[PDB]
CSV table of C-alpha atoms and ligand atoms in Angstrom, one decimal:
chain,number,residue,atom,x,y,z
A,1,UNK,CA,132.2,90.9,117.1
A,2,UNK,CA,129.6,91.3,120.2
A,3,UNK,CA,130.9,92.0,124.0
A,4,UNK,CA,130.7,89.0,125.9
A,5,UNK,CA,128.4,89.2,129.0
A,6,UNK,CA,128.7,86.5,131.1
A,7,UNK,CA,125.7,87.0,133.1
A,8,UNK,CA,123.9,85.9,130.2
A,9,UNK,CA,126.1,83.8,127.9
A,10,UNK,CA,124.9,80.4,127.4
A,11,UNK,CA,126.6,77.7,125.5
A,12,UNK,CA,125.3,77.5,121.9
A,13,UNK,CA,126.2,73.9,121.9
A,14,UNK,CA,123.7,73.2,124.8
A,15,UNK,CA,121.0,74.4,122.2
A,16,UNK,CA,119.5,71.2,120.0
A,17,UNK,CA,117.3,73.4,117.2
A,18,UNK,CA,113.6,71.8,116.4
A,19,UNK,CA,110.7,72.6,114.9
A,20,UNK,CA,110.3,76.9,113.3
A,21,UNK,CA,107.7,78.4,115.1
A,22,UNK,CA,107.3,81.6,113.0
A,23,UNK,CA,109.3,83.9,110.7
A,24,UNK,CA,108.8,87.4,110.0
A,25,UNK,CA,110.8,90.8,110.0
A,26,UNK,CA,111.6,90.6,113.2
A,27,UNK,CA,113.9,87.7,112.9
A,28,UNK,CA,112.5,84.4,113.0
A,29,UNK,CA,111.1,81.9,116.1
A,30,UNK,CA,112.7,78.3,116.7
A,31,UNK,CA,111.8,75.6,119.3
A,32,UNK,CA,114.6,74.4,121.2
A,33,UNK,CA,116.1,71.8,124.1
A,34,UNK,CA,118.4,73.3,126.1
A,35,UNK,CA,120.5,71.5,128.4
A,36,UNK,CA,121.8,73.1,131.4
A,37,UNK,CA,119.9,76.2,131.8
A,38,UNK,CA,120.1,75.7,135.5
A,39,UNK,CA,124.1,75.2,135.5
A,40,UNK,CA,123.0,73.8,139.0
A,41,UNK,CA,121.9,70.5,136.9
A,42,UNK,CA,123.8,70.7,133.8
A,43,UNK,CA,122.4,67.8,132.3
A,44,UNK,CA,119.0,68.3,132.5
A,45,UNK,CA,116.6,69.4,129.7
A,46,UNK,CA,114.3,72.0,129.3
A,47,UNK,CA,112.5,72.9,126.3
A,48,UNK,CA,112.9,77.2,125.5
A,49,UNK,CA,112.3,79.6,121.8
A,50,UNK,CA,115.2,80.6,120.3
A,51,UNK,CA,114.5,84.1,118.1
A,52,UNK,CA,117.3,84.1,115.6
A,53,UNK,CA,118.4,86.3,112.3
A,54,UNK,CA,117.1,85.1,108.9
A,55,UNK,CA,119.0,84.1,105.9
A,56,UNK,CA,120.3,87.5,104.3
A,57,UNK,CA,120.1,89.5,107.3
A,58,UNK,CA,121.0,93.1,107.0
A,59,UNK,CA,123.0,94.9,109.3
A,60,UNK,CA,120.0,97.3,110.5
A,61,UNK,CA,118.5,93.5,111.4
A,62,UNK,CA,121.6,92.7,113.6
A,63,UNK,CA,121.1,95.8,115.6
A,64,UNK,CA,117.1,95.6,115.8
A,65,UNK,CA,118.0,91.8,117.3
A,66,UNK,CA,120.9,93.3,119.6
A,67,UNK,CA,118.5,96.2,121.1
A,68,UNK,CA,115.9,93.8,121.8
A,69,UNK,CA,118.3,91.6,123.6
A,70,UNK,CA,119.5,94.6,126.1
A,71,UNK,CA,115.9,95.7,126.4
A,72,UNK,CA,115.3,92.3,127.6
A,73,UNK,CA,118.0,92.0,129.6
A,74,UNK,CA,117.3,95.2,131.3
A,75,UNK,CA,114.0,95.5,131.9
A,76,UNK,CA,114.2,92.3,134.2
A,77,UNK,CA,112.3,89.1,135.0
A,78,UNK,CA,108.2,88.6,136.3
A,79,UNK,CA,105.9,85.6,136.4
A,80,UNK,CA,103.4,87.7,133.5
A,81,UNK,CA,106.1,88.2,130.9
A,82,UNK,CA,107.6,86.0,128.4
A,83,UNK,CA,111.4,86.0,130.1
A,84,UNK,CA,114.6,86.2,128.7
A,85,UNK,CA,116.3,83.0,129.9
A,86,UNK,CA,120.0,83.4,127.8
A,87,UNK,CA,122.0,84.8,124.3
A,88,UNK,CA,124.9,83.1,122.2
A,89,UNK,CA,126.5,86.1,121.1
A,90,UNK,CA,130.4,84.2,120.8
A,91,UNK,CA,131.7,81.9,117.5
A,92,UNK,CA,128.5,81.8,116.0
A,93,UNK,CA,125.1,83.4,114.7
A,94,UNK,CA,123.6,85.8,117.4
A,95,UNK,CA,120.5,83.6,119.7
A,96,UNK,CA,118.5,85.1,122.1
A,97,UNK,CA,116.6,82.8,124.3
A,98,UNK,CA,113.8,82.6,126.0
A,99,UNK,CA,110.4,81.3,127.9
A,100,UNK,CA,108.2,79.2,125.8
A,101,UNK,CA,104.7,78.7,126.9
A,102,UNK,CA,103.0,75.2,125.6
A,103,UNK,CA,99.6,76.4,124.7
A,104,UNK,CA,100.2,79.1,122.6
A,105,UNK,CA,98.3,83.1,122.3
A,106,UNK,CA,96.1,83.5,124.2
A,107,UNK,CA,93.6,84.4,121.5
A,108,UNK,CA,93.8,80.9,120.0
A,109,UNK,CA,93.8,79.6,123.1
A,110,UNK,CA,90.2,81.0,124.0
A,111,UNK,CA,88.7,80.1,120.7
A,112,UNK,CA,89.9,76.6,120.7
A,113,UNK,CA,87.9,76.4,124.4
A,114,UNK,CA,84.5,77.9,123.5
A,115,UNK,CA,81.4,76.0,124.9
A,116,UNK,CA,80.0,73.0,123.3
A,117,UNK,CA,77.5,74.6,120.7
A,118,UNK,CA,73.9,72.6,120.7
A,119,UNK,CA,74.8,71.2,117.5
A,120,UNK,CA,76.7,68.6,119.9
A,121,UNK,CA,74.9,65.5,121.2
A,122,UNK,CA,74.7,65.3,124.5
A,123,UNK,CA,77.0,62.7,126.3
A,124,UNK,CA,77.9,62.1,129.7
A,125,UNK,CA,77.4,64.4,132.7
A,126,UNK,CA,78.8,67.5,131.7
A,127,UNK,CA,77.9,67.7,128.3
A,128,UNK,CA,77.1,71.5,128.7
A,129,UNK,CA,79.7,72.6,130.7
A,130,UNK,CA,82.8,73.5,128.3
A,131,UNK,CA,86.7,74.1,129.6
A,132,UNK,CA,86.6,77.9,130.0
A,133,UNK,CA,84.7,79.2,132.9
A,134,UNK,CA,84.3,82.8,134.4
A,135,UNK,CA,87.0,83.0,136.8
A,136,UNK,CA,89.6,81.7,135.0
A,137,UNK,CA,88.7,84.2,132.4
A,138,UNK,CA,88.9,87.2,135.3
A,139,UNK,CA,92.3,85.4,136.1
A,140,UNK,CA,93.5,86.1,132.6
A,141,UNK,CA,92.8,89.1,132.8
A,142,UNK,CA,93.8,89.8,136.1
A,143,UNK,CA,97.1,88.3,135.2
A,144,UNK,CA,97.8,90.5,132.1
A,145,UNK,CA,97.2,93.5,134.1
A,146,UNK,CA,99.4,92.2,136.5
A,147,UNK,CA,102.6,92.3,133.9
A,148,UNK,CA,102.0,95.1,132.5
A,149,UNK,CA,101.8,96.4,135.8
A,150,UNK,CA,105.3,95.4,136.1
A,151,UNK,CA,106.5,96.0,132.6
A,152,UNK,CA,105.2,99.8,133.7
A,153,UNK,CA,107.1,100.1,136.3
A,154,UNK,CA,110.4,99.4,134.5
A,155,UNK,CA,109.3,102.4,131.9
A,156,UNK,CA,107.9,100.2,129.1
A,157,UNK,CA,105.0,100.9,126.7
A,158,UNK,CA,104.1,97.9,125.0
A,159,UNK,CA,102.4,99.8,121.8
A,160,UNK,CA,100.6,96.2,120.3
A,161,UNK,CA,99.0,95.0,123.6
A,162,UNK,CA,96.6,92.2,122.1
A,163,UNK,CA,95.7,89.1,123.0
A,164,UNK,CA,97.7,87.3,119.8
A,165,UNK,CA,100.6,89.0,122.0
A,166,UNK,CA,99.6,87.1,125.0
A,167,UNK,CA,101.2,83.8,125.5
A,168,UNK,CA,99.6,80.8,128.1
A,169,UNK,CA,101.9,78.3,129.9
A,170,UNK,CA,101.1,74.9,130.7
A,171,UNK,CA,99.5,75.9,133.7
A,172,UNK,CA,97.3,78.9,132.5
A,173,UNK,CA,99.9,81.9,133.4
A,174,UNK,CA,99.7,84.8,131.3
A,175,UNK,CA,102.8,85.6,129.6
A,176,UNK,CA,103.2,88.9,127.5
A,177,UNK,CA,104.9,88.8,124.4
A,178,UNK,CA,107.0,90.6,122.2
A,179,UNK,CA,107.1,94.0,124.9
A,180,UNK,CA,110.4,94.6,123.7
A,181,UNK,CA,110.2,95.0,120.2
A,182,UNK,CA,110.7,97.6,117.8
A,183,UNK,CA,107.9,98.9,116.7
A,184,UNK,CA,108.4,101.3,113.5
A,185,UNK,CA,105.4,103.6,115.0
A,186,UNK,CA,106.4,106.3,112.3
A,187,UNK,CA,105.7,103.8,109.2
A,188,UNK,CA,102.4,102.0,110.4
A,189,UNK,CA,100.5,100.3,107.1
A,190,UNK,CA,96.9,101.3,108.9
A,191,UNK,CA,95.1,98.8,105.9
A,192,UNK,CA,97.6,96.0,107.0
A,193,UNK,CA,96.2,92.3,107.6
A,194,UNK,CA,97.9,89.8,109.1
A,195,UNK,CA,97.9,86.4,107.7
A,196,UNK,CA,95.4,85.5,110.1
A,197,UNK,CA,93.5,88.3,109.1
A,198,UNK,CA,94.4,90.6,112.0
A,199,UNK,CA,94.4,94.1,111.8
A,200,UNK,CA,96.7,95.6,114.4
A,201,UNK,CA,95.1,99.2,114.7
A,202,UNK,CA,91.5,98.0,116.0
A,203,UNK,CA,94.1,97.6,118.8
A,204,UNK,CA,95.6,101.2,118.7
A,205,UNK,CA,94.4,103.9,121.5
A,206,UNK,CA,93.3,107.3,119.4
A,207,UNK,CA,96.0,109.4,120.4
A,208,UNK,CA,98.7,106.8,118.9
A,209,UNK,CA,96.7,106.2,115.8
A,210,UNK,CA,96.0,110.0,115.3
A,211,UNK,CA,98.8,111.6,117.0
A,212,UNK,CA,101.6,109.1,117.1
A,213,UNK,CA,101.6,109.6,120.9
A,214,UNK,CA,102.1,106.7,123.2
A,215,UNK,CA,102.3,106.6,127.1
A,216,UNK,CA,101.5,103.6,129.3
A,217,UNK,CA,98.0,104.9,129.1
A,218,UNK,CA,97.9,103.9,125.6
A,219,UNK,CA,98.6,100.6,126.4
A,220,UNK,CA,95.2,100.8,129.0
A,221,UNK,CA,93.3,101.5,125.9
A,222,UNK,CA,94.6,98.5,123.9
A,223,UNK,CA,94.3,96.7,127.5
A,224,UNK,CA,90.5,97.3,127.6
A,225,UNK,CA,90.6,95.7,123.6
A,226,UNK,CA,91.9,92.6,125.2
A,227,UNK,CA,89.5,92.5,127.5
A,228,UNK,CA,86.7,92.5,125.1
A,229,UNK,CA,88.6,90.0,123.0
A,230,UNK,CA,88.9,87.3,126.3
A,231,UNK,CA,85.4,87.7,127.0
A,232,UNK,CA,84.2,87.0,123.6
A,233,UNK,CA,86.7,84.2,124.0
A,234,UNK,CA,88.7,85.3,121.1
A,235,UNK,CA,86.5,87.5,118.9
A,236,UNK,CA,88.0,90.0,116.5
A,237,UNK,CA,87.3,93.7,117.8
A,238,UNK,CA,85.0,96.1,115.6
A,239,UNK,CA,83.4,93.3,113.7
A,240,UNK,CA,83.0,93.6,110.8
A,241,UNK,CA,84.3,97.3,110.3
A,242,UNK,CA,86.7,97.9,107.8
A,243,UNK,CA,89.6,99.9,108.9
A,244,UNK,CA,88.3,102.7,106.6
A,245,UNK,CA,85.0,102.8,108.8
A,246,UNK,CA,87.1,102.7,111.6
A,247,UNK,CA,88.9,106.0,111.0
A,248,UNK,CA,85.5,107.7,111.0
A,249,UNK,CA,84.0,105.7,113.8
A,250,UNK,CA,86.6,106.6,116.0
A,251,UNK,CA,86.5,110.3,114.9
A,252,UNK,CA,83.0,110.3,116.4
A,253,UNK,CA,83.5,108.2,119.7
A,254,UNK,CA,82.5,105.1,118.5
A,255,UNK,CA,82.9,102.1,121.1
A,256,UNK,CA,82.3,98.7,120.9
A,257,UNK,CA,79.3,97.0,122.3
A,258,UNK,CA,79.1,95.1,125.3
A,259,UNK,CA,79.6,91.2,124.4
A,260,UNK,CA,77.1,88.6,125.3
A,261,UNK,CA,77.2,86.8,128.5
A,262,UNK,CA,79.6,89.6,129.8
A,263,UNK,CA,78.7,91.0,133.6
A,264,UNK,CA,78.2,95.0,134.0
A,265,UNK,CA,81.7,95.2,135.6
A,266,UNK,CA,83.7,93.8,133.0
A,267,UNK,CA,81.6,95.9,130.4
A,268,UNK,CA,82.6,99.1,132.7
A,269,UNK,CA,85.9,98.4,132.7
A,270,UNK,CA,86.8,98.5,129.2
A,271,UNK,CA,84.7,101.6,129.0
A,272,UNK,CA,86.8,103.2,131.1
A,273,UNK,CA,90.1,102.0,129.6
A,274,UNK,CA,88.5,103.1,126.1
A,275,UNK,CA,88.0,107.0,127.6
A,276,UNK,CA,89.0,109.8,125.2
A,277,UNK,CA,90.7,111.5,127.9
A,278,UNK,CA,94.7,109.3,128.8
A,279,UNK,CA,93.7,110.5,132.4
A,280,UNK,CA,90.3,108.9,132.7
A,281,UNK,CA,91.3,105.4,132.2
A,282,UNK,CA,92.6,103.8,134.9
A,283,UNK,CA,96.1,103.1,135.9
A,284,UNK,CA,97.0,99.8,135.7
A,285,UNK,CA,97.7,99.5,139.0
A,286,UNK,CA,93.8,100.3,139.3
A,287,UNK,CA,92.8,97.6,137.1
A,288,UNK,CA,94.8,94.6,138.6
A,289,UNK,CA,93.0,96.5,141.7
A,290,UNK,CA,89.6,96.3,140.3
A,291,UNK,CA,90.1,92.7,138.9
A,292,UNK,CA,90.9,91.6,142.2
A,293,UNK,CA,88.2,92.5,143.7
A,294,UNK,CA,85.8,90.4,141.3
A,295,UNK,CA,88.4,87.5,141.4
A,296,UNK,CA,88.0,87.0,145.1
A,297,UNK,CA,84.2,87.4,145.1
A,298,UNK,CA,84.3,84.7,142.7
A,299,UNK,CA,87.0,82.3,144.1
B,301,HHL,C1,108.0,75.9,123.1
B,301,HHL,C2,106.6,75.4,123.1
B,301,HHL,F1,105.9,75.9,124.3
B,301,HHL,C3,105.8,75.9,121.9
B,301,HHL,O1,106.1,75.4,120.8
B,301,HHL,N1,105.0,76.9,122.1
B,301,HHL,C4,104.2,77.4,121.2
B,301,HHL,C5,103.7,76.7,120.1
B,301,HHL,C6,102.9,77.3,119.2
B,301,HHL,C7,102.6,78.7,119.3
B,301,HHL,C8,103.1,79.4,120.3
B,301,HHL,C9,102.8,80.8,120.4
B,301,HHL,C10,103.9,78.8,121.3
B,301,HHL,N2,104.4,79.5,122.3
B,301,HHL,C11,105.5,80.3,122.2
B,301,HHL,N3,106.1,80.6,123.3
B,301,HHL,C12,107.3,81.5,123.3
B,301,HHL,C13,107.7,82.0,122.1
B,301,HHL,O2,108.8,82.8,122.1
B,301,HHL,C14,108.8,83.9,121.1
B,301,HHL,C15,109.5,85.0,121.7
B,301,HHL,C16,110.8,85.2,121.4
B,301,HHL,CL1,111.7,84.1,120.4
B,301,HHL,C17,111.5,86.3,121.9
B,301,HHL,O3,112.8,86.5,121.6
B,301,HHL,C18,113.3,87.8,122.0
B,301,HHL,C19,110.8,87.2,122.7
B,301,HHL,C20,109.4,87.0,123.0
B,301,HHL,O4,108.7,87.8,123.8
B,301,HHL,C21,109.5,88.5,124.7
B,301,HHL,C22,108.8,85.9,122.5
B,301,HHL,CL2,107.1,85.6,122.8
B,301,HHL,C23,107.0,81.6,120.9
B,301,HHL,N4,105.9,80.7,121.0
């Protein structure tokens, strides 16, 4: 029953469905080979995620699925975003496809890359020297900053900006996720833990967790949590704070410490995204800015 839109139509039969990637209420994740996404070379294959309804999908799930497709559609393509690459809206279940990054989140990607511990016997020539180093972490950053720099710009407030929503390519890009979604900001389960033990409001800037209010400066905040997270190389934020004790640590101005091994300048920077004030964090056009600067004196 969906308007065709030939712009972004693609063949459903070009699709060859593998292995589930994840399932959840916002429809569920599939790997796929597409052939043909470049109708330049029609044969040629090209491996994408395919987000899909679930089994007993209700109609409310339809039009969640259909909004995020138009918001995707609309708010246009950059190198720092997870793109929309196509839909199969005719004779068949509704697809919407996109980008899919081989390494994963960027939070498991860190913590799968932390330094050899000492509890590992020496071997070779590099035996201390593990995969992440200090510039590529500033590039992360840098990168992220750089998208939502863009996803800004085309009016859109993330509201979850986390590492976990942070997706790395086969060559290192930062790609945000999920900036399109649906959020249900007026029926928020504060206590709620994910099943990797995440709880999304150590993510949320005050004025959205007490007021409901979001801007783009709201994002910043949850921007500066991100930071923290990649230069812990995938820590959980607050640790070990309830979310109880976060209520009441927030009330009072609590802020995270600064993370070992972490220069001054990173430190300051998520200081200032973590301001009380929306107007004293910077932009984040002033953090891809600031991030610049200590990517070229370090490259
Ligand atoms: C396809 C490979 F790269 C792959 O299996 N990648 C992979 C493997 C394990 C874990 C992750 C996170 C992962 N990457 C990955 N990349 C993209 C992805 O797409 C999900 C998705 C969807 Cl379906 C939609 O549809 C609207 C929007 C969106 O955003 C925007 C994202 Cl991230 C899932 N996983």
């Amino acid at each position: 029953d969906l308007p065709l839109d030939p712009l972004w139509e693609f063949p459903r039969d070009r699709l060859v469905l593998g292995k589930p990637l994840g399932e959840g209420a916002f429809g569920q994740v599939v790997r796929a080979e597409a052939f043909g996404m470049d109708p330049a070379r029609p044969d040629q294959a090209s491996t994408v995620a395919v987000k899909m309804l679930k089994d007993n999908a209700s109609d409310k799930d339809l039009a969640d699925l259909v909004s995020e497709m138009e918001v995707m559609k609309l708010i246009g393509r950059h190198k720092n975003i997870i793109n929309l690459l196509g839909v199969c809206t005719q004779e068949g279940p509704l697809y919407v496809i996109v980008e899919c990054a081989a390494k994963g989140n960027l939070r498991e990607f860190l913590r799968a890359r932390r330094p050899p511990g000492p509890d590992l016997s020496p071997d070779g020539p590099r035996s201390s020297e593990g995969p992440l180093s200090f510039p590529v972490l500033v590039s992360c950053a840098y990168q992220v900053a750089r998208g939502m720099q863009y996803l800004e710009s085309r009016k859109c407030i993330h509201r979850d900006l986390a590492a976990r929503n942070v997706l790395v390519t086969e060559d290192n890009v930062m790609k945000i996720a999920d900036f399109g979604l649906a959020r249900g900001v007026h029926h928020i389960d504060y206590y709620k833990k994910t099943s990797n033990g995440r709880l999304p409001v150590k993510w949320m800037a005050p004025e959205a967790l007490f007021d409901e209010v979001y801007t783009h400066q709201s994002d910043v905040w949850s921007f500066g949590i991100l930071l923290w997270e990649i230069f812990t190389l995938g820590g959980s934020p607050y640790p070990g704070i309830p979310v109880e004790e976060l209520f009441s640590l927030l009330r009072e101005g609590h802020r995270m410490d600064r993370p070992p091994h972490c220069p001054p300048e990173l430190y300051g920077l998520m200081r200032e995204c973590w301001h009380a004030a929306p107007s004293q964090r910077p932009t984040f056009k002033q953090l891809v800015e600031a991030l610049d600067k200590v990517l070229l004196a370090v490259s």
